[PDB]
């Protein structure tokens, strides 16, 4: 019933699903594997178990050779992601072939594209779009990056980058941010006058709010955006809670449209708000009183999305399988799957946070 119990169930069932060179995309550095890992990683840090550092190193070993040289997708934020595995493998292996490989990645901040006022562009194929998924695959890293080699520059690349999304896709009705702005207005979800897409998905802000969560502990002490991050994860959590489902006690693929009979409850976008507001409350940027909305969420994951196969496999259901930018009708018809990697780190990830608070709770 302990969040880390679960935890350690999904983790060794994906473990032993796949190998390092068969965990999806097989023998590709992609974030599906880089949000698995991270969750792996998380997991050693709280039980101290071995075998998950060393799973996480594999992985890392797999692609990054002797010499730091490695090979990714080299227009994409997506590729970034993973690099967040490096800096606990260099700390506890000091090994220089985990720092040259995230200087690879850093370097890439200066190659990509942008939109007008200095946004990346989320790929080459997708000119002038940013996507709020973005922020976690770029951000978070930037900020570890910022830290260990001392280069304050990421910290200004960071705060513009955040500051452009929430003023281009904030909506001030509903607090939710849409999935994705096109500063050229040529894609067809874009809207003609503010260039956004026409919908609230799930997955999307989630990752915005676990990138918001965690920045934070990043910036210097008294930056200008400790209390810029702070107020906007406080707007942007009350916003998000407004929606949560009172029977389940979770959120829907389409987080304002749980009336409609097409629409689902996701998983994946709901551990991430697990994990935000968890994080939120033990770092004390959210009021304690959200805890008892967490543990609603918690107990409804585990009742309606879990369940241990016949064989003794523990399966976390209806994770939305990979998903672009879109309209309303695309994002319900998305393939809901089983154990999918960016649900399952995002499950990983949320029960990491969960644990301490489920421990003193009533105290």
Same mark, same amino acid.
């Given at each position: 019933?302990?969040?880390?119990?679960?935890?350690?169930?999904?983790?060794?069932?994906?473990?032993?699903?796949?190998?390092?060179?068969?965990?999806?995309?097989?023998?590709?550095?992609?974030?599906?594997?880089?949000?698995?890992?991270?969750?792996?990683?998380?997991?050693?840090?709280?039980?101290?178990?071995?075998?998950?550092?060393?799973?996480?190193?594999?992985?890392?070993?797999?692609?990054?050779?002797?010499?730091?040289?490695?090979?990714?997708?080299?227009?994409? +934020? &997506?590729?970034?992601?993973? =690099?967040?595995?490096?800096?606990?493998? *260099?700390?506890?292996? /000091?090994? !220089?072939?985990?720092?040259?490989?995230?200087?690879?990645?850093?370097?890439?901040?200066?190659?990509?594209?942008?939109?007008?006022?200095?946004?990346?562009?989320?790929?080459?194929?997708?000119?002038?779009?940013?996507? +709020? &998924?973005?922020?976690?695959? =770029?951000?978070?890293?930037?900020?570890? *990056?910022?830290?260990? /080699?001392? !280069?304050?520059?990421?910290?200004?690349?960071?705060?513009?980058?955040?500051?452009?999304?929430?003023?281009?896709?904030?909506?001030?009705?509903?607090?939710?941010?849409?999935?994705?702005?096109?500063?050229?207005?040529?894609?067809?979800?874009?809207?003609?006058?503010?260039?956004?897409?026409?919908?609230?998905?799930?997955?999307?802000?989630?990752?915005?709010?676990?990138?918001?969560?965690?920045?934070?502990?990043?910036?210097?002490?008294?930056?200008?955006?400790?209390?810029?991050?702070?107020?906007?994860?406080?707007?942007?959590?009350?916003?998000?809670?407004?929606?949560?489902?009172?029977?389940?006690?979770?959120?829907?693929?389409?987080?304002?449209?749980?009336?409609?009979?097409?629409?689902?409850?996701?998983?994946?976008?709901?551990?991430?708000?697990?994990?935000?507001?968890?994080?939120?409350?033990?770092?004390?940027?959210?009021?304690?009183?959200?805890?008892?909305?967490?543990?609603?969420?918690?107990?409804?994951?585990?009742?309606?999305?879990?369940?241990?196969?016949?064989?003794?496999?523990?399966?976390?259901?209806?994770?939305?399988?990979?998903?672009?930018?879109?309209?309303?009708?695309?994002?319900?018809?998305?393939?809901?799957?089983?154990?999918?990697?960016?649900?399952?780190?995002?499950?990983?990830?949320?029960?990491?946070?969960?644990?301490?608070?489920?421990?003193?709770?009533?105290?």
């Amino acid at each position: 019933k302990s969040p880390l119990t679960y935890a350690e169930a999904l983790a060794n069932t994906i473990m032993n699903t796949y190998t390092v060179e068969e965990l999806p995309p097989a023998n590709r550095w992609h974030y599906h594997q880089g949000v698995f890992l991270c969750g792996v990683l998380r997991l050693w840090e709280a039980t101290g178990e071995k075998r998950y550092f060393e799973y996480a190193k594999a992985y890392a070993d797999l692609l990054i050779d002797d010499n730091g040289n490695l090979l990714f997708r080299r227009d994409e +934020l &997506d590729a970034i992601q993973a =690099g967040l595995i490096l800096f606990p493998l *260099y700390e506890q292996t /000091k090994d !220089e072939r985990y720092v040259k490989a995230a200087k690879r990645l850093r370097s890439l901040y200066g190659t990509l594209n942008r939109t007008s006022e200095g946004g990346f562009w989320h790929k080459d194929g997708y000119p002038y779009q940013m996507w +709020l &998924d973005g922020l976690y695959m =770029g951000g978070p890293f930037a900020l570890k *990056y910022a830290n260990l /080699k001392q !280069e304050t520059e990421l910290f200004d690349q960071v705060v513009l980058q955040e500051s452009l999304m929430r003023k281009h896709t904030k909506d001030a009705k509903t607090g939710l941010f849409y999935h994705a702005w096109d500063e050229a207005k040529k894609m067809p979800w874009a809207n003609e006058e503010t260039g956004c897409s026409p919908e609230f998905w799930a997955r999307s802000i989630g990752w915005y709010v676990m990138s918001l969560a965690d920045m934070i502990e990043e910036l210097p002490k008294k930056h200008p955006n400790r209390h810029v991050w702070k107020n906007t994860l406080q707007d942007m959590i009350k916003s998000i809670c407004r929606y949560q489902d009172k029977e389940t006690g979770l959120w829907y693929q389409i987080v304002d449209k749980g009336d409609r009979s097409d629409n689902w409850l996701e998983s994946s976008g709901s551990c991430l708000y697990m994990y935000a507001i968890a994080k939120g409350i033990n770092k004390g940027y959210l009021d304690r009183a959200y805890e008892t909305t967490l543990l609603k969420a918690y107990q409804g994951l585990i009742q309606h999305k879990t369940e241990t196969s016949e064989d003794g496999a523990f399966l976390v259901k209806d994770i939305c399988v990979g998903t672009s930018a879109g309209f309303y009708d695309y994002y319900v018809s998305r393939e809901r799957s089983t154990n999918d990697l960016h649900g399952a780190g995002a499950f990983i990830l949320a029960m990491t946070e969960l644990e301490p608070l489920f421990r003193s709770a009533g105290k």
